[PDB]
Amino acid sequence: VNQIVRIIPTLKANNRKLNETFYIETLGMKALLEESAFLSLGDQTGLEKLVLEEAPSMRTRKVEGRKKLARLIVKVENPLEIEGILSKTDSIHRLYKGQNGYAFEIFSPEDDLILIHAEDDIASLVEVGEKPEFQTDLASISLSKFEISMELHLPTDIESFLESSEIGASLDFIPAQGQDLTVDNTVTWDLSMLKFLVNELDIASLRQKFESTEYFIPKSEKFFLGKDRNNVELWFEEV
Template sequence: MSEIIDRIVAFQPVYRVLHREENLDFFRDVLGLKVLMEEGAMVWLGGHEAKLDRFQLEESPGLRSVNGYKKHSRTVIKAATSEIEQLLARDLEKVAKVYRGKSGYTFEAVSPENDVFLVTAEELTDLSALTEIEKSEVNVVRDKDFKGLSDFVISEIDLNVADKEIIEFYESVFSMKTIDGVFDFPFVSLKLSVADGEDVSAATDETFDLEFLIFMIDKMFDLEAFSAQFEDVDGTYLDASAKTFSLEVPSHVELWFVK
């Protein structure tokens, strides 16, 4: 396994959105997340008790909606069974689909920017065994004191790419091969699928889509030496203190490695 993989301590995706409050209503009410901090155009989201940054939104007026497939296909959020039940009890009408699995209910919800989120207590290996059910079959009792998810993790992100060359670029960054387009990192599963769409290769500052993936790195890791491997790659940046390195995946998203 690549040395960089062993030194990653946290992971966050960043999504571009149009109307901040409309999107925050979705993330707070439907997904049960808590706004931890807002600064400028950025919003950090996490759980109500753990209060760890899990992902970010960037309000980006002036961009446009995606035509056809998005780069971001789906994000899988893993949470506690009892808390998923409470989300359904609170806002069942706002979810798109409901499933039943080994660990209870799972639901799929679609954001105002057409980003798909699957909220589940299942292991990734059990997702294929989920059975879709009618909303009328959901039987839960609402707890009026429930505020939202106490904590959660992003267990999988599914991304669309224009061609296999992009998958190979990701493999070169992490010095590991995918299995059927899937990176099984210790901290998240990253699934890459080739899709035919005019905006799958759009610039990150053009559409409402996944903007970049942030990998938080152990402070002792030599980020400068890591960045030197990509001297011949366009679209790289290393800050003066060698604590942040960004890398543009050609015709896809940006990868940020941050101490």
């Protein structure tokens, strides 16, 4: 009961079209759902893997220092799809290569650092200095299959409600200092929610877990919304 099937991060986005151009046009993700509050992103499986959420500059500001999101990691299945992407973009931050193929880093419009790679262990990545030219026999940049994981910056004086037992390999905590690492999630453009899709939802265990804190159960009982000690929202529902 409450076994984690998938974790979906929500990143706050300032300019929608900017962020769309980046994740869809540049990176090769698919728009699944186009609501007005948010863009549901995924791949050709049709499954949601990343959510962007719009926050106006009226209400919102840029992180100073380390972000709660240290890095978003996009593990691509076909490595020739990464080379397809690079054949089309002028603006990568850094190029790597490992066992299975090339990999790169690039900053998003909200300065989130994204690693796109194809490795069974991203620790095999070696930085290539001189950029090559990339060819492609592929007819579409679209990423067919990818898996999101992430590195999260966590201060040393707080503990996440998230257990290593639960959060597996999808989530890596890096010790970190910075003013905005525990800021209320309305304050900055950053990681604002993690959604956990689970085998069966148990509201009782979750109530117990977050007893020391604010939580929310809708009248439908279809999910449980808790809040982590760094003020990232933690949403649980069935898959």
